[PDB]
Amino acid sequence: SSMILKYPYRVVDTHEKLKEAVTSLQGARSIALDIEAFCTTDQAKQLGRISLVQACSDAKPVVFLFDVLTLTPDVFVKDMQSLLSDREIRKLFFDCRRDVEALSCQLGVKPEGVLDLQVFFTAIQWKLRSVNRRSGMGYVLKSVAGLTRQEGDSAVQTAMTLGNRPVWDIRPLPDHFLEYAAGDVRHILLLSNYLVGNKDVPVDVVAVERLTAQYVEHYAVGKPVITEADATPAEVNRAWLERYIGPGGGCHFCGAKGHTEAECFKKQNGKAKCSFCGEVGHTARNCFKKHPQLL
Template sequence: MRAFQLYTCAAFRGLVRSTVATPARTISQSTPLSSSTHDVDGSSSSGGAASTSPARTSWSHVSSRFSSFPVTGDCAAILKYPYKVISTEQELKEAVGVLQRSRQIAIDVEAFCTPEAIKTPQLGRVSLVQTCSDVVPVVFLFDVLSLSVPVFMQALRPVFHDETIRKLFFDCRRDIEALSTQMDLTPKRVLDLQLLFTALQWKLRSVNRRSGMTYVLKSVAGIHRQEGDSAVQTAMMVGDRPVWDTRPLPEHFLEYAADDVRHIHLLSTYFPSLTQQVSEAAVERLTAQYVEHYGIGHAVTEEADAQPAQVNTAWLERYIGPGGVCSFCGSKGHTETECFRKLNGNMRCSFCGGTGHTARNCFQKHPELLKCDRCGQLGHSTANCFRANPCKHCGGNHRSENCHYRAHIANA
């Protein structure tokens, strides 16, 4: 992806709003939603939000891939921001006052999981709305169920409609749709960091694939999501129940929700250095197209993208410009340093040792590249999903030719 001058995390500290490091006033955790013992100084009974990994490459001009930066200083502090559950109108008033002083706010939504039988891309009932701003080092978890939609909507409307405040999302499509449909809230001046990452890929390789948060975090910041996230994700995919309707929510659920906006805020401190290839203003215009498409006040009947894991190519060309090609062979999908023709087909993956691919595209290193759009599991594509294509003999989650029931019938 990448052909940029890279810098150490220290160079990025100036990009973080100076107010982030401003000591915050003490905020107590006076909510029945959680038994968290978090303090504003960043301490937590559950430990850090994410583990860090050391940098893997030197700080030099890299033409083909992102390097992982060491997460230190102010960057690491973002991962330790405590959360504050907002469940009363007084807490809501105070939190909104903080957000109104912000220049940018990371936003995410947690909603009830819908039963698999419904098979709808839309989110269920909104349970939490998470924010992380550049004013105080605290994540606000707005408990929409406790506050009620009308109260939350009235309080947050001035913030969402304030065009002097930039709202940061990561894959805004379903969140925008849910906020617009359920709350009549369509935020203005939105920047989708997933679109920014894809736009960079597009300018270098003509690749319009969407990358998940796990992959982007590892590629850009060199960090891994904590193990507790997998437990929450499993609960959201198994059992056909809403999950986020539970009160009080478990500690690891609240941490999971807070992590989403911590990570968005963290990524925003890295991306500005990469706008030599694509401007943030252009990505804001691209994001505005998605907000216009999904923020229509009711469920979208026609998706903006041909595939869920892709960005609309026509919109990329309109707002970002023509896609990049290999400067050696003129082909799309790779850069010169990844070109098999230039390397005479001797490309070897530095991660698994296999030939014919790079570590950037290695499914062993990045199983999320094979994330199934049908069930959300990693390691296989939709075409190979057993939920979509169960065994034709017994309906089980395995290949039909490997069915023991079939063998039993044949031997009977």
């Protein structure tokens, strides 16, 4: 699965290349998606103009970078909409809210069969700790796969953070912009191997598909979305978490919300440590080394 991180990118910027990419993605079971958009100077909620859509599936070891700007939304949608609409093909996102709004407003398509892995992580946190906070991809990759995420080129990130120019409008795109764009979908598809079809994961994939579908419905309405689904940008609607995931959990050792027993201070600090030999698990009064007359 760390093979996914070495998938090279192909730029899909012609009608011919688009048919080929579409043919390959049609054979997939899961497709990780992302959007790179023109930076908004204003810094309002919606993504700016779609520049690239990035796709990486379990059907081929490759990241497609669809140059929507060059192809035009019209040509892109003609060939991609049935695949986007096909609920039998899982679309994997990391925070789908804005991406879905953009697909709806700018391309006229609503994706079906969507799974939001940022929402998946929060659902796990809800189930175990009563935490409805959203985590960045870095934190999630670390916590779930033990991977330190290789950041993208700092020029790209800096240009974007300044917010005074579009950034993603230049053509051709330099190589380091393309490599930046390909980053997220590889991480998304990698991450889905740890979350989907894994019995160590305490939430059902279908419950998260159902929570994801609330986000798709809220954000794919053909127009800019005014009222947000979540109380603040960095969390997940608690009422939706109760509905699709169930009641929030907490620490089985001390009863408090916010942590599990493996992270409980009181559980670790409460365990017997031998004052004589140092080993956790017995007291001194039961220590074979301190008292050999117990052998």
